[PDB]
Design a protein around this ligand. Structure first.
Ligand SMILES: [Mg+2]
Ligand SMILES: [Mg+2]
Ligand SMILES: [Mg+2]
Ligand SMILES: [Mg+2]
Ligand SMILES: [Mg+2]
Ligand SMILES: [Mg+2]
Ligand SMILES: [Mg+2]
Ligand SMILES: [Mg+2]
Ligand SMILES: [Mg+2]
Ligand SMILES: [Mg+2]
Ligand SMILES: [Mg+2]
Ligand SMILES: [Mg+2]
Ligand SMILES: [Mg+2]
Ligand SMILES: [Mg+2]
Ligand SMILES: [Mg+2]
Ligand SMILES: [Mg+2]
Ligand SMILES: [Mg+2]
Ligand SMILES: [Mg+2]
Ligand SMILES: [Mg+2]
Ligand SMILES: [Mg+2]
Ligand SMILES: [Mg+2]
Ligand SMILES: [Mg+2]
Ligand SMILES: [Mg+2]
Ligand SMILES: [Mg+2]
Ligand SMILES: [Mg+2]
Ligand SMILES: [Mg+2]
Ligand SMILES: [Mg+2]
Ligand SMILES: [Mg+2]
Ligand SMILES: [Mg+2]
Ligand SMILES: [Mg+2]
Ligand SMILES: [Mg+2]
Ligand SMILES: [Mg+2]
Ligand SMILES: [Mg+2]
Ligand SMILES: [Mg+2]
Ligand SMILES: [Mg+2]
Ligand SMILES: [Mg+2]
Ligand SMILES: [Mg+2]
Ligand SMILES: [Mg+2]
Ligand SMILES: [Mg+2]
Ligand SMILES: [Mg+2]
Ligand SMILES: [Mg+2]
Ligand SMILES: [Mg+2]
Ligand SMILES: [Mg+2]
Ligand SMILES: [Mg+2]
Ligand SMILES: [Mg+2]
Ligand SMILES: [Mg+2]
Ligand SMILES: [Mg+2]
Ligand SMILES: [Mg+2]
Ligand SMILES: [Mg+2]
Ligand SMILES: [Mg+2]
Ligand SMILES: [Mg+2]
Ligand SMILES: [Mg+2]
Ligand SMILES: [Mg+2]
Ligand SMILES: [Mg+2]
Ligand SMILES: [Mg+2]
Ligand SMILES: [Mg+2]
Ligand SMILES: [Mg+2]
Ligand SMILES: [Mg+2]
Ligand SMILES: [Mg+2]
Ligand SMILES: [Mg+2]
Ligand SMILES: [Mg+2]
Ligand SMILES: [Mg+2]
Ligand SMILES: [Mg+2]
Ligand SMILES: [Mg+2]
Ligand SMILES: [Mg+2]
Ligand SMILES: [Mg+2]
Ligand SMILES: [Mg+2]
Ligand SMILES: [Mg+2]
Ligand SMILES: [Mg+2]
Ligand SMILES: [Mg+2]
Ligand SMILES: [Mg+2]
Ligand SMILES: [Mg+2]
Ligand SMILES: [Mg+2]
Ligand SMILES: [Mg+2]
Ligand SMILES: [Mg+2]
Ligand SMILES: [Mg+2]
Ligand SMILES: [Mg+2]
Ligand SMILES: [Mg+2]
Ligand SMILES: [Mg+2]
Ligand SMILES: [Mg+2]
Ligand SMILES: [Mg+2]
Ligand SMILES: [Mg+2]
Ligand SMILES: [Mg+2]
Ligand SMILES: [Mg+2]
Ligand SMILES: [Mg+2]
Ligand SMILES: [Mg+2]
Ligand SMILES: [Mg+2]
Ligand SMILES: [Mg+2]
Ligand SMILES: [Mg+2]
Ligand SMILES: [Mg+2]
Ligand SMILES: [Mg+2]
Ligand SMILES: [Mg+2]
Ligand SMILES: [Mg+2]
Ligand SMILES: [Mg+2]
Ligand SMILES: [Mg+2]
Ligand SMILES: [Mg+2]
Ligand SMILES: [Mg+2]
Ligand SMILES: [Mg+2]
Ligand SMILES: [Mg+2]
Ligand SMILES: [Mg+2]
Ligand SMILES: [Mg+2]
Ligand SMILES: [Mg+2]
Ligand SMILES: [Mg+2]
Ligand SMILES: [Mg+2]
Ligand SMILES: [Mg+2]
Ligand SMILES: [Mg+2]
Ligand SMILES: [Mg+2]
Ligand SMILES: [Mg+2]
Ligand SMILES: [Mg+2]
Ligand SMILES: [Mg+2]
Ligand SMILES: [Mg+2]
Ligand SMILES: [Mg+2]
Ligand SMILES: [Mg+2]
Ligand SMILES: [Mg+2]
Ligand SMILES: [Mg+2]
Ligand SMILES: [Mg+2]
Ligand SMILES: [Mg+2]
Ligand SMILES: [Mg+2]
Ligand SMILES: [Mg+2]
Ligand SMILES: [Mg+2]
Ligand SMILES: [Mg+2]
Ligand SMILES: [Mg+2]
Ligand SMILES: [Mg+2]
Ligand SMILES: [Mg+2]
Ligand SMILES: [Mg+2]
Ligand SMILES: [Mg+2]
Ligand SMILES: [Mg+2]
Ligand SMILES: [Mg+2]
Ligand SMILES: [Mg+2]
Ligand SMILES: [Mg+2]
Ligand SMILES: [Mg+2]
Ligand SMILES: [Mg+2]
Ligand SMILES: [Mg+2]
Ligand SMILES: [Mg+2]
Ligand SMILES: [Mg+2]
Ligand SMILES: [Mg+2]
Ligand SMILES: [Mg+2]
Ligand SMILES: [Mg+2]
Ligand SMILES: [Mg+2]
Ligand SMILES: [Mg+2]
Ligand SMILES: [Mg+2]
Ligand SMILES: [Mg+2]
Ligand SMILES: [Mg+2]
Ligand SMILES: [Mg+2]
Ligand SMILES: [Mg+2]
Ligand SMILES: [Mg+2]
Ligand SMILES: [Mg+2]
Ligand SMILES: [Mg+2]
Ligand SMILES: [Mg+2]
Ligand SMILES: [Mg+2]
Ligand SMILES: [Mg+2]
Ligand SMILES: [Mg+2]
Ligand SMILES: [Mg+2]
Ligand SMILES: [Mg+2]
Ligand SMILES: [Mg+2]
Ligand SMILES: [Mg+2]
Ligand SMILES: [Mg+2]
Ligand SMILES: [Mg+2]
Ligand SMILES: [Mg+2]
Ligand SMILES: [Mg+2]
Ligand SMILES: [Mg+2]
Ligand SMILES: [Mg+2]
Ligand SMILES: [Mg+2]
Ligand SMILES: [Mg+2]
Ligand SMILES: [Mg+2]
Ligand SMILES: [Mg+2]
Ligand SMILES: [Mg+2]
Ligand SMILES: [Mg+2]
Ligand SMILES: [Mg+2]
Ligand SMILES: [Mg+2]
Ligand SMILES: [Mg+2]
Ligand SMILES: [Mg+2]
Ligand SMILES: [Mg+2]
Ligand SMILES: [Mg+2]
Ligand SMILES: [Mg+2]
Ligand SMILES: [Mg+2]
Ligand SMILES: [Mg+2]
Ligand SMILES: [Mg+2]
Ligand SMILES: [Mg+2]
Ligand SMILES: [Mg+2]
Ligand SMILES: [Mg+2]
Ligand SMILES: [Mg+2]
Ligand SMILES: [Mg+2]
Ligand SMILES: [Mg+2]
Ligand SMILES: [Mg+2]
Ligand SMILES: [Mg+2]
Ligand SMILES: [Mg+2]
Ligand SMILES: [Mg+2]
Ligand SMILES: [Mg+2]
Ligand SMILES: [Mg+2]
Ligand SMILES: [Mg+2]
Ligand SMILES: [Mg+2]
Ligand SMILES: [Mg+2]
Ligand SMILES: [Mg+2]
Ligand SMILES: [Mg+2]
Ligand SMILES: [Mg+2]
Ligand SMILES: [Mg+2]
Ligand SMILES: [Mg+2]
Ligand SMILES: [Mg+2]
Ligand SMILES: [Mg+2]
Ligand SMILES: [Mg+2]
Ligand SMILES: [Mg+2]
Ligand SMILES: [Mg+2]
Ligand SMILES: [Mg+2]
Ligand SMILES: [Mg+2]
Ligand SMILES: [Mg+2]
Ligand SMILES: [Mg+2]
Ligand SMILES: [Mg+2]
Ligand SMILES: [Mg+2]
Ligand SMILES: [Mg+2]
Ligand SMILES: [Mg+2]
Ligand SMILES: [Mg+2]
Ligand SMILES: [Mg+2]
Ligand SMILES: [Mg+2]
Ligand SMILES: [Mg+2]
Ligand SMILES: [Mg+2]
Ligand SMILES: [Mg+2]
Ligand SMILES: [Mg+2]
Ligand SMILES: [Mg+2]
Ligand SMILES: [Mg+2]
Ligand SMILES: [Mg+2]
Ligand SMILES: [Mg+2]
Ligand SMILES: [Mg+2]
Ligand SMILES: [Mg+2]
Ligand SMILES: [Mg+2]
Ligand SMILES: [Mg+2]
Ligand SMILES: [Mg+2]
Ligand SMILES: [Mg+2]
Ligand SMILES: [Mg+2]
Ligand SMILES: [Mg+2]
Ligand SMILES: [Mg+2]
Ligand SMILES: [Mg+2]
Ligand SMILES: [Mg+2]
Ligand SMILES: [Mg+2]
Ligand SMILES: [Mg+2]
Ligand SMILES: [Mg+2]
Ligand SMILES: [Mg+2]
Ligand SMILES: [Mg+2]
Ligand SMILES: [Mg+2]
Ligand SMILES: [Mg+2]
Ligand SMILES: [Mg+2]
Ligand SMILES: [Mg+2]
Ligand SMILES: [Mg+2]
Ligand SMILES: [Mg+2]
Ligand SMILES: [Mg+2]
Ligand SMILES: [Mg+2]
Ligand SMILES: [Mg+2]
Ligand SMILES: [Mg+2]
Ligand SMILES: [Mg+2]
Ligand SMILES: [Mg+2]
Ligand SMILES: [Mg+2]
Ligand SMILES: [Mg+2]
Ligand SMILES: [Mg+2]
Ligand SMILES: [Mg+2]
Ligand SMILES: [Mg+2]
Ligand SMILES: [Mg+2]
Ligand SMILES: [Mg+2]
Ligand SMILES: [Mg+2]
Ligand SMILES: [Mg+2]
Ligand SMILES: [Mg+2]
Ligand SMILES: [Mg+2]
Ligand SMILES: [Mg+2]
Ligand SMILES: [Mg+2]
Ligand SMILES: [Mg+2]
Ligand SMILES: [Mg+2]
Ligand SMILES: [Mg+2]
Ligand SMILES: [Mg+2]
Ligand SMILES: [Mg+2]
Ligand SMILES: [Mg+2]
Ligand SMILES: [Mg+2]
Ligand SMILES: [Mg+2]
Ligand SMILES: [Mg+2]
Ligand SMILES: [Mg+2]
Ligand SMILES: [Mg+2]
Ligand SMILES: [Mg+2]
Ligand SMILES: [Mg+2]
Ligand SMILES: [Mg+2]
Ligand SMILES: [Mg+2]
Ligand SMILES: [Mg+2]
Ligand SMILES: [Mg+2]
Ligand SMILES: [Mg+2]
Ligand SMILES: [Zn+2]
Lengths: 122, 204, 131, 12, 59, 118
RNA sequence: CGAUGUCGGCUCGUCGCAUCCUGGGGCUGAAGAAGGUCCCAAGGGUUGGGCUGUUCGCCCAUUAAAGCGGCACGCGAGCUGGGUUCAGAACGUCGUGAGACAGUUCGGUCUCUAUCCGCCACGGGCGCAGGAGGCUUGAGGGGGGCUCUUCCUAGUACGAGAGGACCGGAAGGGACGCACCUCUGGUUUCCCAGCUGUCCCUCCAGGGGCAUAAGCUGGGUAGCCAUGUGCGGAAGGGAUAACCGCUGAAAGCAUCUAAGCGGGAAGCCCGCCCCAAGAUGAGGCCUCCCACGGCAGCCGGUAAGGACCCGGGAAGACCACCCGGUGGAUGGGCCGGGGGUGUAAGCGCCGCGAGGCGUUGAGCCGACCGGUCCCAAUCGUCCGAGGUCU
RNA sequence: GAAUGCCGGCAUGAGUAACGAUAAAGAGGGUGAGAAUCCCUCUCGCCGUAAGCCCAAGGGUUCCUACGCAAUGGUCGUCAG
RNA sequence: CGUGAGGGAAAGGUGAAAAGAACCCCGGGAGGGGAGUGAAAUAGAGCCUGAAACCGUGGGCUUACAAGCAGUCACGGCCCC
């Protein structure tokens, strides 16, 4: 459950480390973003000479949330944090690695690249 | 159009195609017709159904009369279904096959005197920044000298719930005729033990 | 009329009786039936069960695991048809029913606080000795 | 729009 | 608040109209089958002390 | 709302209310019959009934249980040795409530008697 | 001027339409796609942030769109009090000065009780010509009305290319609304456990009070809940707006019109949901009572029925509604199940000891699903038709 | 007949707001025409660098008994400054 | 009422005569009902006369589909003379 002002861990090697959501790209007026949704965010912390740097306004897709998500099979899943993977306008990862597990809901949402690159899909 | 009386019994989810599906269990059968409303007699078409057996010690004479003229056991509840005329003398859950969509009417839970926030989803007031005893108040209710009054219909606090509610186009998930159960997907007005009406849906 | 028995009558067709008993504190391997386009496979989720919330057919249990640097909690319904099986991998000894607190503990701290449940371990090897 | 008070703030 | 106040004196007619609902309902009483005295139902008869056929109380 | 909630509040906070039933229990168990207001009366039944049922058990545990509310060893001895045996065969309903016919003068409160059963 | 509280915000709307979007059109320097411009249309919708007291405005990120106005520049007996009107103090400036300045700065008392109309709810009364118990018809009201992405048709029509449809079909969303509690997630004032200090019971052990109106801490049923779930906007019929026609004169031609007939909007009427016979225009059906004693009236007892009282209730402020009242499962006990808590006390064994192990998923245990007449709803009472006349 | 006149009497608002710290109450037994409120007992709760004790100002019989309950006591009153 | 200087009220009437109501009755008392006094007792001490607002009890006419500065003009019904 991500909304504007929410900080997110970045789970790739784009060089970003911390992004703060400034918009959830989902309709006229979405209040929250969850796994598989794309947000616009500000880079709040980076590491020297990455693709991205502090101050940049980038796009990312949420891949992990602390608020558990529910599944039609009656189950749920929940992560230790809220994380995202920074993307380009074609929904492709701007990094070349993604770290930690990602939610399976990404596959059916057309983020196959990121799903693949992930070490585990839960 | 077809329908049946029943009581709401409770909720669960069942499993159907690796999916959890929220259901409300309803005990609908069996309902004896105790009068039919006919255009030549009543001016419209319907069936007065009876529901749940009653202790004859509690049924008075004008009521006894009505039942007997229909050759029917004394029943606790009498209610009509409009534009429904079953061939039989008795209506059971079997008039509903799974996959059908239905309209369920019941009596909503009563919140009694409800504030404007619960009732009408008002925003109420601030909880700080100087808010003075108005944290749950409804704000302005009008203009000034023009019109110098309050609209009929102004959303205000007052009783809320315990009213007729129909939720529509609910799926029939299963039906267990040997126990007079109906299994409807989703939520149904009112408390367990609450009388509900189940009609085939009006949606298309 | 007995409204409770009715509900349990409905639920009865779906109820499982083949799963092993585990407690909060136990370490567990849940082999779960997963769909991934366009086939379905079995993915194993294995960790400590930190919660078992009971409600008859509607009991559900929560399992906690740390995968690739991140903590993961999974909630499973005890009678889901998508669970192939459950293997008890370790009996752990809890002193409370909900173990939410292990979320803030180091792996070492957890290890101490969840001593192996020697008794129910002995029971585990005491059964399984079959004719 | 800012126009000036015609009436003072009410005192005790 | 700004201290609301009656705008006009209420008429003799109007105050008495308000009180058209103010009459007391007489106490509901029944005979005690033991001593035939009048008492409220479902209470122990305060004269002979009997309720449900037996002596319960020293009156 | 109050939908399916059990327990009167009796215009007392948590600890006063608890104390109230306990003192009533001490007085009922003591004098065999007390007079209260009808609402306290009706509410006193189960509280006392439970205590009598434990006396019907007799074990050291149940004694120490009752002591938590009743607090008086002598009163409990009376409970275990003289009271409880009277109820050996009775299945609940160790108390009764009958309403008096006259209200309190000073505040109009309706009154009732609560007694241990034969 | 024997007082019409004054900007901005908040809350709550409601109307207009000179229409921001969505729908329907004509013309286009309209190939397609996308624009322009005008017409019809007010049903719904019209986001979140940074700066400023701001209205406004600029900027960020979006969007179908981020409309403009009226309502005492709507709304202070609804809140705010940042701004502007008091008393303090300073800066620039003006004045010899006291002081002053559509110049700035920091600070600065906003009133528990609603009589009438109006509004939201809920009853009492009487009426609806016999008296009653049920079930209904719907005059007339209210509610709702939004919209996007992607896929198929089809990389087709159109275009050199870039780009890329109409019509038709399918899936998935955002916001809003109504209900609901199976799941997720909250609360759960005592449902269970752990802990501290102190006082106490009874010395140990075991407990109780107090530390908040829970001492603190970890958990938590039912209920009430949203972050959770179901479902809704329609479909469809009808009459229309701009606009497009068929047939067709006056006017041998032409003309959508003068006779007549078609097509045509998210809009209008019906349809969906809810209220509703005080609809005094007081409706309809089913069933019950009945042909009373006294001198369209009176008094008196009854009939069918109702109320009183009582046990209660996901009903509720009182009232009302609903259920039950011993020919009874209504509440309270008790018992069984669920559920929570998480292995009581006592004893045994191990250890110098704090403890640990076993007995033991034990002990305790609100509300949830049930059973059981053990407790209490004892016993009763009062009303209550005789049907006006053409 | 009016002076927001003067003095007095009586209305309306209204059986309404309130009854003055949320430290807290329950039962039994007395007394009496009458008792939630007076006395006694038991249980419960609150203060304890005080909400206990002793001085000085100030107040002036309020002290102690007996006998009272019209008024005073924000209810009651058999009790009481 | 004000520390003080100082401010500064309200409050008359039984009957000729107390003959001021023995005694009985209800009641804790207050109060009342008889008895008695008096020319008179709604002259009974809360006392001459006893207006008005204001409150109540009884009776006549009238009101629950109706629009108001409350009246007035007309007609009709009902009650009384
Ligand atoms: Mg990471
Ligand atoms: Mg920087
Ligand atoms: Mg940038
Ligand atoms: Mg099935
Ligand atoms: Mg018909
Ligand atoms: Mg019809
Ligand atoms: Mg038909
Ligand atoms: Mg119904
Ligand atoms: Mg509330
Ligand atoms: Mg609320
Ligand atoms: Mg609501
Ligand atoms: Mg707000
Ligand atoms: Mg709020
Ligand atoms: Mg304030
Ligand atoms: Mg204030
Ligand atoms: Mg506040
Ligand atoms: Mg105003
Ligand atoms: Mg007006
Ligand atoms: Mg209601
Ligand atoms: Mg509704
Ligand atoms: Mg219907
Ligand atoms: Mg559907
Ligand atoms: Mg039942
Ligand atoms: Mg259930
Ligand atoms: Mg059965
Ligand atoms: Mg089960
Ligand atoms: Mg089961
Ligand atoms: Mg270590
Ligand atoms: Mg062992
Ligand atoms: Mg003021
Ligand atoms: Mg205030
Ligand atoms: Mg008035
Ligand atoms: Mg007047
Ligand atoms: Mg007046
Ligand atoms: Mg008035
Ligand atoms: Mg009058
Ligand atoms: Mg009035
Ligand atoms: Mg009797
Ligand atoms: Mg509440
Ligand atoms: Mg209940
Ligand atoms: Mg309750
Ligand atoms: Mg109860
Ligand atoms: Mg309780
Ligand atoms: Mg109660
Ligand atoms: Mg209170
Ligand atoms: Mg209270
Ligand atoms: Mg109170
Ligand atoms: Mg209290
Ligand atoms: Mg406490
Ligand atoms: Mg005694
Ligand atoms: Mg119990
Ligand atoms: Mg105790
Ligand atoms: Mg009583
Ligand atoms: Mg009574
Ligand atoms: Mg009385
Ligand atoms: Mg009193
Ligand atoms: Mg003025
Ligand atoms: Mg004024
Ligand atoms: Mg004025
Ligand atoms: Mg603002
Ligand atoms: Mg506000
Ligand atoms: Mg604000
Ligand atoms: Mg706000
Ligand atoms: Mg308006
Ligand atoms: Mg508007
Ligand atoms: Mg507006
Ligand atoms: Mg224009
Ligand atoms: Mg614009
Ligand atoms: Mg358009
Ligand atoms: Mg348009
Ligand atoms: Mg155009
Ligand atoms: Mg075009
Ligand atoms: Mg062009
Ligand atoms: Mg072009
Ligand atoms: Mg133009
Ligand atoms: Mg223009
Ligand atoms: Mg224009
Ligand atoms: Mg226009
Ligand atoms: Mg519009
Ligand atoms: Mg409009
Ligand atoms: Mg508008
Ligand atoms: Mg904004
Ligand atoms: Mg900032
Ligand atoms: Mg701003
Ligand atoms: Mg601004
Ligand atoms: Mg401008
Ligand atoms: Mg500006
Ligand atoms: Mg600028
Ligand atoms: Mg567009
Ligand atoms: Mg904006
Ligand atoms: Mg604009
Ligand atoms: Mg506007
Ligand atoms: Mg305006
Ligand atoms: Mg203006
Ligand atoms: Mg304004
Ligand atoms: Mg404005
Ligand atoms: Mg105003
Ligand atoms: Mg104000
Ligand atoms: Mg203002
Ligand atoms: Mg005003
Ligand atoms: Mg308000
Ligand atoms: Mg300022
Ligand atoms: Mg200064
Ligand atoms: Mg100068
Ligand atoms: Mg100078
Ligand atoms: Mg000069
Ligand atoms: Mg000047
Ligand atoms: Mg100045
Ligand atoms: Mg100035
Ligand atoms: Mg200025
Ligand atoms: Mg100035
Ligand atoms: Mg300036
Ligand atoms: Mg300056
Ligand atoms: Mg300033
Ligand atoms: Mg300050
Ligand atoms: Mg200032
Ligand atoms: Mg200010
Ligand atoms: Mg201030
Ligand atoms: Mg009030
Ligand atoms: Mg009023
Ligand atoms: Mg108010
Ligand atoms: Mg008025
Ligand atoms: Mg009104
Ligand atoms: Mg009603
Ligand atoms: Mg009514
Ligand atoms: Mg009404
Ligand atoms: Mg009435
Ligand atoms: Mg009539
Ligand atoms: Mg009739
Ligand atoms: Mg009935
Ligand atoms: Mg009726
Ligand atoms: Mg009826
Ligand atoms: Mg009809
Ligand atoms: Mg209609
Ligand atoms: Mg009407
Ligand atoms: Mg293709
Ligand atoms: Mg294609
Ligand atoms: Mg191409
Ligand atoms: Mg191509
Ligand atoms: Mg084609
Ligand atoms: Mg080509
Ligand atoms: Mg292309
Ligand atoms: Mg299409
Ligand atoms: Mg949709
Ligand atoms: Mg709306
Ligand atoms: Mg629930
Ligand atoms: Mg539940
Ligand atoms: Mg829950
Ligand atoms: Mg939960
Ligand atoms: Mg929790
Ligand atoms: Mg307990
Ligand atoms: Mg405690
Ligand atoms: Mg302790
Ligand atoms: Mg001691
Ligand atoms: Mg000890
Ligand atoms: Mg202890
Ligand atoms: Mg305790
Ligand atoms: Mg203590
Ligand atoms: Mg405590
Ligand atoms: Mg203490
Ligand atoms: Mg604290
Ligand atoms: Mg707690
Ligand atoms: Mg929970
Ligand atoms: Mg709960
Ligand atoms: Mg929600
Ligand atoms: Mg559906
Ligand atoms: Mg249509
Ligand atoms: Mg048409
Ligand atoms: Mg043509
Ligand atoms: Mg032609
Ligand atoms: Mg021609
Ligand atoms: Mg024509
Ligand atoms: Mg013409
Ligand atoms: Mg046409
Ligand atoms: Mg055509
Ligand atoms: Mg639409
Ligand atoms: Mg209806
Ligand atoms: Mg009706
Ligand atoms: Mg009618
Ligand atoms: Mg009706
Ligand atoms: Mg009419
Ligand atoms: Mg008629
Ligand atoms: Mg009728
Ligand atoms: Mg019927
Ligand atoms: Mg007869
Ligand atoms: Mg005769
Ligand atoms: Mg009868
Ligand atoms: Mg009742
Ligand atoms: Mg309720
Ligand atoms: Mg009640
Ligand atoms: Mg009442
Ligand atoms: Mg009944
Ligand atoms: Mg009876
Ligand atoms: Mg019996
Ligand atoms: Mg029962
Ligand atoms: Mg029971
Ligand atoms: Mg269990
Ligand atoms: Mg142990
Ligand atoms: Mg043990
Ligand atoms: Mg040793
Ligand atoms: Mg030893
Ligand atoms: Mg064992
Ligand atoms: Mg046990
Ligand atoms: Mg149990
Ligand atoms: Mg429970
Ligand atoms: Mg159950
Ligand atoms: Mg039960
Ligand atoms: Mg019995
Ligand atoms: Mg039986
Ligand atoms: Mg009668
Ligand atoms: Mg004739
Ligand atoms: Mg004059
Ligand atoms: Mg005057
Ligand atoms: Mg005045
Ligand atoms: Mg004057
Ligand atoms: Mg005066
Ligand atoms: Mg008065
Ligand atoms: Mg009242
Ligand atoms: Mg009032
Ligand atoms: Mg009030
Ligand atoms: Mg009050
Ligand atoms: Mg006080
Ligand atoms: Mg006071
Ligand atoms: Mg007090
Ligand atoms: Mg209090
Ligand atoms: Mg305390
Ligand atoms: Mg109290
Ligand atoms: Mg006594
Ligand atoms: Mg005596
Ligand atoms: Mg007393
Ligand atoms: Mg007294
Ligand atoms: Mg006493
Ligand atoms: Mg007292
Ligand atoms: Mg007191
Ligand atoms: Mg005692
Ligand atoms: Mg202290
Ligand atoms: Mg000390
Ligand atoms: Mg201290
Ligand atoms: Mg002293
Ligand atoms: Mg002295
Ligand atoms: Mg003095
Ligand atoms: Mg003195
Ligand atoms: Mg002496
Ligand atoms: Mg006195
Ligand atoms: Mg007194
Ligand atoms: Mg007295
Ligand atoms: Mg005296
Ligand atoms: Mg007094
Ligand atoms: Mg006082
Ligand atoms: Mg005395
Ligand atoms: Mg004395
Ligand atoms: Mg003294
Ligand atoms: Mg003085
Ligand atoms: Mg003085
Ligand atoms: Mg003096
Ligand atoms: Mg005089
Ligand atoms: Mg004289
Ligand atoms: Mg004289
Ligand atoms: Mg006497
Ligand atoms: Mg006497
Ligand atoms: Mg006395
Ligand atoms: Mg006397
Ligand atoms: Mg006398
Ligand atoms: Mg004489
Ligand atoms: Mg004489
Ligand atoms: Mg003479
Ligand atoms: Mg005389
Ligand atoms: Mg006399
Ligand atoms: Mg006279
Ligand atoms: Mg005289
Ligand atoms: Mg004289
Ligand atoms: Mg006189
Ligand atoms: Mg007089
Ligand atoms: Mg007079
Ligand atoms: Mg009169
Ligand atoms: Mg009419
Ligand atoms: Mg009339
Ligand atoms: Mg009228
Ligand atoms: Mg009127
Ligand atoms: Mg007029
Ligand atoms: Mg007239
Ligand atoms: Zn008697």
């Amino acid at each position: 459950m991500i909304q504007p002002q929410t900080y997110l861990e970045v789970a790739d090697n784009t060089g970003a480390r911390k992004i703060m959501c400034i918009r959830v790209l989902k309709g006229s007026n979405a209040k929250y973003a969850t796994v598989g949704d794309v947000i616009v965010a500000s880079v709040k912390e980076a590491i020297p000479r990455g693709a991205v740097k502090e101050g940049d306004v980038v796009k990312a897709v949420v891949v992990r949330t602390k608020k558990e998500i529910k599944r039609p099979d009656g189950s749920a899943i929940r992560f230790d944090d809220n994380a995202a993977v920074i993307i380009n306008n074609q929904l492709e990862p701007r990094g070349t690695r993604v770290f930690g597990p990602v939610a399976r809901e990404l596959r059916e949402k057309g983020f196959m690249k990121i799903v693949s690159l992930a070490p585990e899909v839960l | 159009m077809k329908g049946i009386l029943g009581v709401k019994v409770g909720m669960t989810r069942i499993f159907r195609d690796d999916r959890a599906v929220p259901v409300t269990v309803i005990l609908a059968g069996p309902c004896p017709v105790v009068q039919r409303r006919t255009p030549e007699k009543d001016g419209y078409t319907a069936v007065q159904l009876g529901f749940l057996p009653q202790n004859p010690k509690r049924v008075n004479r004008p009521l006894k009369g009505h039942f007997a003229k229909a050759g029917v056991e004394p029943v606790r509840i009498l209610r009509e279904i409009r534009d429904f005329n079953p061939e039989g003398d008795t209506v059971t859950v079997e008039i509903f096959k799974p996959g059908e969509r239905v309209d369920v009417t019941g009596t909503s839970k009563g919140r009694g005197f409800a504030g404007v926030m619960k009732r009408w989803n008002f925003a109420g007031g601030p909880d700080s920044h100087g808010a003075h005893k108005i944290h749950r108040h409804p704000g302005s209710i009008g203009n000034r000298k023009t019109p110098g009054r309050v609209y009929k219909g102004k959303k205000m606090a007052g009783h809320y719930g315990a009213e007729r509610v129909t939720v529509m186009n609910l799926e029939v998930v299963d039906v267990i005729p040997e126990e007079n159960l109906l299994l409807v997907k989703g939520a149904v007005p009112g408390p367990n033990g609450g009388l509900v009406i189940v009609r085939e849906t009006k949606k298309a | 009329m007995n409204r409770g028995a009715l509900i349990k009558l409905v639920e009865s067709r779906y109820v499982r009786t083949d799963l092993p008993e585990f407690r909060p504190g136990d370490t567990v391997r849940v082999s779960y039936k997963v769909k991934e386009g366009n086939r379905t496979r079995i993915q194993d989720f294995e960790g400590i069960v930190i919660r078992i919330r009971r409600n008859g057919f509607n009991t559900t249990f929560t399992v906690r695991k740390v995968s690739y640097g991140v903590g993961v909690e999974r909630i499973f319904p005890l009678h889901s048809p998508l669970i192939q099986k459950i293997d008890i991998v370790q009996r752990g000894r809890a002193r409370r029913a909900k173990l939410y607190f292990i979320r803030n503990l180091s792996d070492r701290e957890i290890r101490r606080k969840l001593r192996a449940d020697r008794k129910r371990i002995d029971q585990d090897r005491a059964a399984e000795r079959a004719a | 729009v800012d126009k000036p008070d015609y009436r003072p703030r009410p005192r005790p | 608040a700004k201290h609301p106040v009656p705008k006009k004196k209420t008429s003799k007619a109007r105050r008495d109209a308000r009180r058209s609902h103010h009459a007391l309902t007489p106490p509901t009483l029944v005979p005690c089958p033991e001593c035939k005295a009048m008492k409220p139902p479902h209470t122990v008869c305060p004269e002979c002390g009997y309720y449900a056929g037996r002596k319960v109380l020293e009156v | 709302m109050r939908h399916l909630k059990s327990g009167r509040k009796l215009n007392r906070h948590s600890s006063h209310r608890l104390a109230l039933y306990r003192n009533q229990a001490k007085s009922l168990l003591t004098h065999g019959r007390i007079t209260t207001t009808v609402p306290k009366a009706k509410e006193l039944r189960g509280f006392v009934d439970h205590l009598i049922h434990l006396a019907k058990r007799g074990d050291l545990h149940a004694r120490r249980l009752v002591l938590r509310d009743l607090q008086d060893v002598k009163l409990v001895r009376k409970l275990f040795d003289e009271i409880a045996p009277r109820y050996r065969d009775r299945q609940g309903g160790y108390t009764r409530v009958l309403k008096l016919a006259e209200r309190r003068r000073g505040d109009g409160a309706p009154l009732a008697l609560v007694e241990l059963v034969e």
